[model samples]
Target: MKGIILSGGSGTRLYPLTKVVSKQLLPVYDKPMVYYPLSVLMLAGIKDILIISTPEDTPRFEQLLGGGSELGISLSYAVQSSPDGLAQAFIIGEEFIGDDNVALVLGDNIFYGHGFTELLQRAANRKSGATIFGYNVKDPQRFGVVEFDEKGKVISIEEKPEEPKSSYAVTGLYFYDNRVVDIAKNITPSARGELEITDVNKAYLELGELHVELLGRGFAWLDTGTHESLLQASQFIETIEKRQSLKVACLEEIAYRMGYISREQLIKLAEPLMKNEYGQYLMNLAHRS
Candidate 1:
């Protein structure tokens, strides 16, 4: 399978700060926001990734991430001329995703939890259908809410409904079979004049094949689209790192752990930043391995 990080949004919510930078490039504590989602795909053992961004931002992401070889992965980039919709990623990435199952992760989404790696690995190994996650949020009306039957089968999904039937809101991460390319193509544009991702998932749900994974109380799914949420996500990561003495979303360490890069490669990557805790952790991880 392959992975695509949708980093194309205008980020109007961030205002003057984002006026000069892509939201995905913003720091989410110790690392850029893109690192979190990139870490997710890495955790899933995906070696090839395509990052879709605005034309202006695409160059920066390419310069920063650079083919991903430093992390022992292959990285490519594309540009989305406008903020069409979430499902536009599939259309823009059709060539990159050709003949392969793909995972779509929103660049601004951050997920952390115990057993999270297991969940991602499971989803990555899926051979068919679509997989979407449901996270219980207090403000369900603010998100794409999902409703399911007693058997845990998805019954309905609504995008930002005024009244929500369930607290479960669909998270940004998604896994789909190759048919997603066609599904994305054929879906009619909503009244909003953009292709909706919910429509693509609904098509799968109609087939009785859209699997919904519920993230229970143990998980943290943060959408860093607003100033408040961005700060909260940083605080959450800081608390976890300070309490556990472990770095969250440390890419080099993950690459080493997954055997994508050797211990020597990790050492080379860590030596430059050895003065800081982040690099110290990577060096320690290398030594332990």
Candidate 2:
């Protein structure tokens, strides 16, 4: 499946801090916010990916990630041009998706847990239907929550409902078959004047083709949108790495382990930061390679 990272939008919630740089480029922990979703896709074995962003902001992704060639992957980009809501990312990325199955992840969302890569890989190969995961959050009203039956069948899907039947909120990451293009196309602009992703998912759910996965309790699903959340995300990373002596979303190690880049490339990349413990970790990884 191809991957599309929706990194566009005005980022009004972030305001002055985002006035100059795209919110996706802002630090979430030590890495840029986009790295979380981007790394998620890479971990799922997706190499050919496209970043969709506003014209003014697209170049920054290029500046940060380049073309993905150096890492033995293919990364391209597209301009979203307008704020057409979340589902419209499929519309803008129609050509980029081509005939392949597709995975879409919001640039600001992060997912972490053991065996997540295996879970995503199993879902990616589904020949039909849409796959979405629900993450349990305390403030369900702040997100699109899914109400599932005792058998784990999704009985109802609500977009930010006040009285949530369950605390399981749908995370931004999604996978769909090629039919998502037509599904997205058939959707009308929502009351908010943009195509809603929930609308697209409902289309599949009605057809009994929507597959839901529970992200489960041990996962850390973070929505680092506000300044406080962003700083907290960074601190979360700092604490995890310092205590465990392991990096959560270390890009070079991800690249190497996924076969997206080689040991030599990983070393060359880590050489710049080797004076620090982060560098030593990379060198250790290089030794392993």
Candidate 3:
């Protein structure tokens, strides 16, 4: 399966700070916000990925991730000329996603939990249909609220409904078969003049091919779109790392642990930043026996 990170947006929420940089480039504790979603794709065992960002920010993302060779993966980039919508990723990445199942994750979304890797792999291994996640959030009205029957079957999904049927909100990550490209192409722009991802999912649901995975307790789905949420996400990561003595979303560590890169390669990547604790942590992992 291929992977797409939709990092395109004006980021008007963070205003002045984002005026000069993409929100995805902002730091979330120790790493850039984009790393969290990229780590998610990596954890799912996806090797070829495409990052979709604004033209101005595409070069910055390329500069930061750079072909993904250092991590033993392939990273390609594309430009989203406008802030169209989440489903626009499929339309923009048609060539990159060419005839393969794809996973799309919002670059600003950060997901962390125990057993998360298992869930990711399971979703990535599906041979057919579309898979999305549902997390119980306090403010479902602010998200795409999903309703489920007593038998745990999805009943309906409403985007920002005034009266939410359930507390479960669809998370930013999505997995879909190759049909998503054509589905996205046929979807009419919403009243807001953008292609809505909810419409794309609805198409799959109508075909009885949409599957919803529930993220139960001990899981976090942080959307760092607002200033407050961004800081909270950083604090959350800092607490977890300090208490567990393990880093979250450490790309190089994940690549090495997944056998994508050798210990010697990890050591080489770590040497340049030896002056910092992050590099020191990587060095320790390289020598761990």
lDDT of 1 by residue, 1-289 (tens): 9999998788999987789899999999989999999999999989999999998999999988899989999999999999889899999999999999999999999999998888899999999999999999999998888999988899998888888999999999999999999999988888767788889999998899999888898899998989999999999999998888678889898898899999999999999989997888888888882
How do all the candidates rank in terms of TM-score, highest first?
Answer: 3, 1, 2
For 74-146, candidate 3 gives per-residue lDDT tens digits of 9999999999988899999999999999999999999999889999999999979889999999999998888
Misplaced by over 4 Å in model 1 are none
**Number of backbone collisions per candidate:** 0, 1, 0
Candidate 1 or 3, higher TM-score?
Answer: 3
* Per-residue lDDT of 241 in model 1: 87
- Model 3: lDDT of residue 2: 95
Model 1 residue 211 lDDT?
Answer: 91
Question: Candidate 1: worst 10 consecutive residues by lDDT?
Answer: 188-197
lDDT rank, highest first? Answer: 3, 1, 2
lDDT of 1: 0.92
Cα-based lDDT for every prediction: 0.92, 0.87, 0.93
lDDT of model 2 at residue 127? 73
- Candidate 2 structure quality by residue, lDDT tens digits, 24-43: 99987678888889888888
How high is the lDDT of residue 20 in model 3? 86
Which candidate has the highest TM-score of all? 3
- Candidate 3 wrong stretches, greater than 4 Å: none
